[PDB]
Amino acid sequence: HNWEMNYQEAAIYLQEGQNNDKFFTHPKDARALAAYLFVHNHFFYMMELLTALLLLLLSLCESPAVPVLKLHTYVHATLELFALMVVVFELCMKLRWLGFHTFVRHKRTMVKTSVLVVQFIEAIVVLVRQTSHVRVTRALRCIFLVDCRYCGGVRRNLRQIFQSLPPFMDILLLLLFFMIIFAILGFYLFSTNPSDPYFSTLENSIVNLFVLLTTANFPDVMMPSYSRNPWSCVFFIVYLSIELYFIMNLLLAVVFDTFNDIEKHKFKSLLLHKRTAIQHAYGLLASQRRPAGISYRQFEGLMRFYKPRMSARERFLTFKALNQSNTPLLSLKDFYDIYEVAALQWKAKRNRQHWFDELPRTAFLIFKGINILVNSKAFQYFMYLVVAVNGVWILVETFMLKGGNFTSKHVPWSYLVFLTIYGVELFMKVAGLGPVEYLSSGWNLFDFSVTAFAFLGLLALTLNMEPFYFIVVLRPLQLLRLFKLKKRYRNVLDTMFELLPRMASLGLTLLTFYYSFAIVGMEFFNGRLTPNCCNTSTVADAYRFINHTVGNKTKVEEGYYYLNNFDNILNSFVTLFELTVVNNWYIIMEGVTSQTSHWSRLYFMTFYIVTMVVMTIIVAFILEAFVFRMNYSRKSGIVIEKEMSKEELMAVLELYREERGTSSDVTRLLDTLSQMEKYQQNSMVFLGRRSRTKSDLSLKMYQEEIQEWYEEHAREQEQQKLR
Amino acid sequence: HNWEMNYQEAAIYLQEGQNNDKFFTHPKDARALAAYLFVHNHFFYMMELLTALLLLLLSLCESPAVPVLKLHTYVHATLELFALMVVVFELCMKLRWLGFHTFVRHKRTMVKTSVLVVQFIEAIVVLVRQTSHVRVTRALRCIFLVDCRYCGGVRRNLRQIFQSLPPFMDILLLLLFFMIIFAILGFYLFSTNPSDPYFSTLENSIVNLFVLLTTANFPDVMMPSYSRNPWSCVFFIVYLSIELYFIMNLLLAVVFDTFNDIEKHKFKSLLLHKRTAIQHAYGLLASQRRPAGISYRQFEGLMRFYKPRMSARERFLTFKALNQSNTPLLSLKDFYDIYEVAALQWKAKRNRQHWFDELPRTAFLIFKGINILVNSKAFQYFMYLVVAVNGVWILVETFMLKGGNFTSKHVPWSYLVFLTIYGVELFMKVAGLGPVEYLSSGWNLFDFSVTAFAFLGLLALTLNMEPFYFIVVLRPLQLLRLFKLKKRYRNVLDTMFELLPRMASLGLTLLTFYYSFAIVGMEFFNGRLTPNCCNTSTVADAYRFINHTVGNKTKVEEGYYYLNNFDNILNSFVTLFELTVVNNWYIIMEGVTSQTSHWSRLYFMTFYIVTMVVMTIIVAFILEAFVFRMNYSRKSGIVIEKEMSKEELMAVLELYREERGTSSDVTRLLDTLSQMEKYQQNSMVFLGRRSRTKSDLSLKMYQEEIQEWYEEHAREQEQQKLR
Ligand SMILES: *[C@@H]1O[C@H](CO)[C@@H](O[C@@H]2O[C@H](CO)[C@@H](O)[C@H](O)[C@H]2NC(C)=O)[C@H](O)[C@H]1NC(C)=O
Ligand SMILES: *[C@@H]1O[C@H](CO)[C@@H](O[C@@H]2O[C@H](CO)[C@@H](O)[C@H](O)[C@H]2NC(C)=O)[C@H](O)[C@H]1NC(C)=O
Ligand SMILES: *[C@@H]1O[C@H](CO)[C@@H](O)[C@H](O)[C@H]1NC(C)=O
Ligand SMILES: *[C@@H]1O[C@H](CO)[C@@H](O)[C@H](O)[C@H]1NC(C)=O
Ligand code: NA
Ligand code: NA
């Protein structure tokens, strides 16, 4: 019980090295160990996130809601009470794990407790009065999402846009300085004009130049001055070529540079944190013996709690893979590489195929012959001609049937023939190569997926299921196979498919900002946009709904911009998505401000600044990752190969049978014995493959100054371990 | 005559090292030397450019012209004949300088001869018929501009956008591939709708999705589908978030990376070309003596033809500054640095001020005391409070006089008092510091310039000159002094003012592309846009001009987009500038195509692709230069200090009086003798300051692999100098 307490404690010291938290897990009692084990279970994470998504997705049943989900007020008030009750359960177990002083000084938990208190109080107020008040506190409900473990990518993304914000704010200050100067001079030059509503008041000119900054109304503000005096074009040329050409590109440059330094120090602090984590782990497995090292049974324990799904043969392989010495023990230099060796999967050296062992003759030459021909180059070179024939067939059938080849309810024999030939070569390729040897590439599962949609088109044509005909309309996705010829497409789609998870996280941060702005706009802008509204405004043309009932058929004219409501979450997400692409945003602004006040211009101006920050940080991320990988591949997974003897396997078998593990460890070592008996050899030569990530990539790039970081951090340990 | 022929030939070998041309100047006769000297005179350059700008600026007098400059047809036909006659004079002297084989194999000159031939022939045709034909050949007239010497920056910029074009074109191909897929499926889903003109035909849907790609009509195309089925938002969300979020940012990343490699190899090939230039220069000054080196009188000759304006004392200073050895001769290692030492200006060590030598007492304590106090910190700290008082005064007077503080014809005592205090401290600072010690900074000449505008405001207020009142309207430019407090503004405005010449060149390349597209659109789109035109089109609302003559005052409504003509060069430059900022470009497209054909959509689509290339290359340039300087200042002009003795100055005086130069060399060495006699010393200690450029910056950055470039190039000389 003493050793296993040391093994679980040391396995915690490795697990906390990856998630960038400071070290708090040191137990005085075993109750803290049981509390860590209770709160870092996989079930606790899924409970925490599913409560958070229930608490967000309940907001489409509130007093502004879709009409099909309009619950009664006590129902959703009680559902908020139960969801907040189990969030109190979450914080109760967090308090049991940490202390009391650590639970207060930790900032993130205290933020979540405060938001819990205010939403709990206002929920009880709703349940008493049974009428919803203004209830603007729902915008803070995102904090329950972001504190979860599964969106820690969202969290470090969000602090990365926080840290890059001062070099944004100063250049934003310079840009606003020039628009106030040009708004003053614009008010002087064009206010003496009874024809334009664009420069009637100095505040109205500040508004119209803030909209001109983002290129939203450019010719329409220039024209009434350009009608009188043709030399007024120099005003808008000089203004727009200062801001759109100097200052905006300057802003992209400055945020890009700061993003580079933040990436460098993020990597550095992660390395130093992993360094102290491994040093504490080696310290807990101290020897009190005349050599300094770790015996094999302790490394059994570390791989028995950390990485629990790794069996015995791979455990001994990881012990030799870290060894790199002819010793019975380990070191530190041969032990700091534990993160990059324990992450791989081990295989033996067979040469078989997954569909040949059952086979006798008279059919083995068939399938082996298919594997032979499917490895040939001219077969692939035949397949690209088939795809090109498909593409010319779609193009010629298009410009012969005059574009009417898609609405018809009979397929003109193209999609039948082509899906047959793609399908039989799909089945031939998979059965020829084996399933896992086929799935291991990238483009092949794309071929499998798109034909997998495509057979449902045949399920849609011959049967009585009309609305699946759009799969038949998606013929030309098969031409996307053909991009794998040119080299730059393979490179740039490799980096596209490798940057996808971070762009998913950036998208979810953007949905956080949309959620809070959608709620805080949902309450104040509820029913202020109707058809034929805002008729006294200046953009009254866009809000119109006119019947022309001549001929008893009432042909209707409408400008449709009244559909951008703020009625529920769904119309407001569609509206806010129409504001982040920039064009025609001042129409929604001038409509809402023509119904509420002058102060609600400030809502939309603030929204444009926030979406400007988020989009320029997305651009900066894509540029850094693409430049970093392109600099790697012009300065040059991984496969390791080791081997173990027969007698070492027998002795380790004696130790494992002594230690009395499960039957799987014994019988898989017996299976290794059967492989040595069937092949009639002495040593088992193995392979371990690991995929290459950004961490090892950054180690190869910053390999010049990294030793200075280690040595400086070593003496800063000694300055902080004499006190 | 033998030595001076060697000096002028070697000075040519240095001058051709900078301008990246290959070596052709080797003379068999002195006539080639006289031809080089005739064609690289400063007068020849100014003749070449002024002919080119006359030939471009004549195009605003043609058959499409402004009505105030409408010349007769024989007049401008003859002016084209004379301008092309002197361009033939230019090519005649170019042919005299080179050979005949070199003049043909050189590509750039042969391009200019061919364009000369076709414009000469069509000019004679105009002079015969006296009526202008379609005359589309004027778009090629830009080649006469770009071949000049003063816009060689334009030329290397233009080949840099040529070389970066394939990694643009392949991703453009992928982006067009996805818009054709979504146009097919958009035509299937929304053609069964009698309410929208956006998906009536497959070609019309390809057009509207190509416009949706550039965010020009985003809500207006979404709405008629969004009115029927609210789930049609997923179509435009998925489409716009593939293209605007993955592919467009991918295009910026790819063009950025290629721009980095092109910058690296541009710097490398410039270094190797300078290397061979100096080796030929040292070869022409070969010794045929028992040491290997260059005597002083030959270095006199090199500095007498190369850098002619450098006098004798600075010549000897440059001979010791290259020496770095106790030798009477030179080397190669001490001679490859000739470009970076000959570029500086030498000064002595005085300590006086430019306004103190005349002064006796009773006024010397005045001006010296002013220099004392103007060097003090709390005086500057007083001045920033004065500027902040000015800013709060403008703001409070604005929100007290309700924005009407600018139209009034009396100044409310602010601009009088503030221009007096800024003015007296300007004169106090300049007279206290001296003129050249004041101008040498950056912000100080900004203060001088803005107050220099500001006194003309007092010339405008009290006098009978009304239209200069806008200088009084430009009060708040004085607040731009106050940005020099925060550090990041000083850094980012240093890089802004240091990247300005290249952005000027990028702007002039953009005006080249506008010029050719303005002419080729001027002839075919001449009178096709009138008021109340295009009424059968779909954008007929924008072209309207209606009188409402009730009440005998005729209040007029108009949509103003008929002013974007193609009548002359000036309305067409204003139109094309309205197309490069993107917004509302499809209205000009749909108008012109509603008057000509369907084929003139292709004009505007081609223009959007061209301006997309040019703008993303401007963005890539700003990012590289800003990142490069920010990486320099986080891995860390120049001043050198040397001295010469008295006897060395006397001996070199004997040699210069032997060689019988002008009186300036003798009498300035006599002035150095008078300084040694007045200060009563032995040695003159001097300083040479040089401004830091991108070349030395790049030498400090790429200092790791540069020796490999030199040694590889040395053996590639030996492989190319055994044959
Ligand atoms: C502009 O809109 C207002 C409503 O905001 C219209 O005013 C209404 O006019 C009708 C006559 O058609 C009256 O019966 C209502 O009592 C008015 N309502 C209010 C609140 O005043 C106005 O007519 C519209 N102007 C137009 C369409 O030109
Ligand atoms: C649309 O514009 C055309 C001109 O392009 C107009 O057609 C003219 O109509 C007037 C009657 O007002 C006739 O006298 C002319 O002979 C017509 N010209 C041509 C070339 O057909 C037409 O009326 C306009 N339609 C509107 C304003 O609804
Ligand atoms: C137009 O007529 C329809 C009935 O066909 C009606 O539903 C709609 O409200 C009318 N629009 C008005 C009165 O603005
Ligand atoms: C409107 O009236 C003015 C005269 O005040 C005239 O110049 C203009 O051509 C008229 N516009 C029309 C008839 O469209
Ligand atoms: Na836009
Ligand atoms: Na951009």
Curated annotation (Swiss-Prot), chains A, B:
Na(+) current is inhibited by ATP in a MTORC-dependent manner. ATP sensitivity is independent of PI(3,5)P2. Probably regulated by Mg(2+) ions, cytosolic Mg(2+) selectively inhibits outward current while lysosomal Mg(2+) modestly inhibits both the outward and inward currents. In the absence of Mg(2+), NAADP readily activates TPCN2, with properties similar to PI(3,5)P2. Both current elicited by PI(3,5)P2 as well as NAADP are inhibited by tetrandrine. It catalyses: Na(+)(in) = Na(+)(out); Ca(2+)(in) = Ca(2+)(out). It comes from the Eukaryota. Its main location: membrane. Residues 199-222, 566-589 dip into the membrane without crossing it. Keywords: Calcium, Calcium channel, Calcium transport, Coiled coil, Endosome, Glycoprotein, Ion channel, Ion transport, Lysosome, Membrane, Repeat, Transmembrane, Transmembrane helix, Transport, Voltage-gated channel. N-glycosylated. GO terms for cellular component: early endosome membrane; endolysosome; endosome membrane; lysosomal membrane; membrane; monoatomic ion channel complex; recycling endosome membrane. Residues 70-72, 129-137, 192-198, 223-233, 402-415, 463-470, 526-565, 590-606 are extracellular. It is found in: Lysosome membrane; Endosome membrane; Early endosome membrane; Recycling endosome membrane. Each of the two internal repeats contains five hydrophobic transmembrane segments (S1, S2, S3, S5, S6) and one positively charged transmembrane segment (S4). S4 segments represent the voltage-sensor and are characterized by a series of positively charged amino acids at every third position. Belongs to the calcium channel alpha-1 subunit (TC 1.A.1.11) family. Two pore calcium channel subfamily. Intracellular channel initially characterized as a non-selective Ca(2+)-permeable channel activated by NAADP (nicotinic acid adenine dinucleotide phosphate), it is also a voltage-gated highly-selective Na(+) channel activated directly by PI(3,5)P2 (phosphatidylinositol 3,5-bisphosphate) that senses pH changes and confers electrical excitability to organelles. Localizes to the early and recycling endosomes membranes where it plays a role in the uptake and processing of proteins and regulates organellar membrane excitability, membrane trafficking and pH homeostasis. This is Two pore calcium channel protein 1.
